[PDB]
Amino acid sequence: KILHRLLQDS
Amino acid sequence: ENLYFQGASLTEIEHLVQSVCKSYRETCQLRLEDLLRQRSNIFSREEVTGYQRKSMWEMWERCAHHLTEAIQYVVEFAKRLSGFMELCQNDQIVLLKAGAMEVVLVRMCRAYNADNRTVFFEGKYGGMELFRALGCSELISSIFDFSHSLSALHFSEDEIALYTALVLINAHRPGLQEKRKVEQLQYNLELAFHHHLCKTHRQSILAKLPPKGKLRSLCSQHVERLQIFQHLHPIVVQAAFPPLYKELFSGG
Ligand SMILES: NC(=O)N1CCc2cc(Cl)ccc21
Ligand code: NA
């Protein structure tokens, strides 16, 4: 859940 | 999708050196000038004893939080790395799951003072004895030895930037869907690193870099020690460990 969010957060 | 997914010219490799070094400079958790200045700031015998008296679970919690903070900076480094955001989401996660801890282990050598075998932790320098409550003496000793070995290379910030870019962009990681794209990005980052060493008369470090398997051994030992801890204190892991740490090291 977290990694996907960090990678998507621009 | 990205220039670096195909063959790059000398001038493009030179640009890649600059881009990687810039990405690293912008994503340091700790400034080198700060780490060097703080070397005289060492935990007293009383402070060391205080850390040793902490419960095993309280110490694991603190250390997992500090590791998670470091990993967040590595994720940002990855996102800024030429070509990384052009890989598919599956491959980005594969590379970060396998490589984030390896990059943190390398970055650690900057925070390690080889002169007195101490590491910067919670505002002061302390020896490996500070971590005795974790009950993973072998692993801590091995990480200190690793930092000691890297410290003997006298890396510049630019060398760390280019070396850690390669630690992360590894086309051999199991699970990569676009393996050929990763191989080409790795090839260009390898050229960028070797070009910088050639230009700075530092090619002699290549034969001195840690062997194949050393970083993997330290990462596997970390996961093994965490599994031992998890068996002892399962609710500490479930309730109090950072969600990102659990996604990386205990499969969610
Ligand atoms: N600075 C910092 O957060 N460090 C340095 C040494 C260390 C060991 C563990 Cl287990 C967790 C974090 C840290
Ligand atoms: Na060092």
Token pair for residue B241?
A: 């460990």
The answer to whether residue A5 neighbours chain B at the CB level (below 8 Å) is: no
Residue B135: left if φ>0, alpha if ψ -120 to 50, beta else—which one? left
Using CA atoms, how far apart are residues B170 and B95, in angstroms rounded to an integer? 7
**Is B66's C-beta closer than 6 angstroms to any atom of ligand 1?**
yes
Using CA atoms, how far apart are residues B114 and B128, in angstroms rounded to an integer? 12
E strands, B67-129, in order: 112-113, 118-121, 124-126
The answer to whether residue B80 neighbours chain A at the CB level (below 8 Å) is: no
Cβ pair B118, B44 in contact under 8 A? no
Cβ pair B232, B85 in contact under 8 A? no
Q: Quick one: DSSP state of residue B120? A: E
What contacts B103, CB < 8 A, 6 or more positions away?
B74, B77, B164, B167, B168
Resolution in angstroms comes to: 1.7
E strands, B51-187, in order: 112-113, 118-121, 124-126
Residue B90 is which amino acid? N
Cα B152 from chain centroid? 17
- Closest by CA to A3, choosing from B20, B90, B67, is B90
β-sheet bridge partners, residue B120: B125
Of B96, B97, B247, the CB nearest to A1: B247
Place of tokens 């940002």: B76
Cβ pair A3, B93 in contact under 8 A? yes
Cβ pair B119, B113 in contact under 8 A? yes
Token pair for residue B27?
A: 């994503």
Could you give all domains of chain B from N- to C-terminal order, each with its CATH number? 1-252 (1.10.565.10)
Cβ pair B168, B20 in contact under 8 A? no
Sign (positive or negative) of CA dihedral B114, B157, B211, B68: positive
Ligand 1 center to B63 CA (angstroms): 6
Alpha-carbon Rg for chain B in angstroms: 19
- A vs B: CB pairs below 8 A: 24
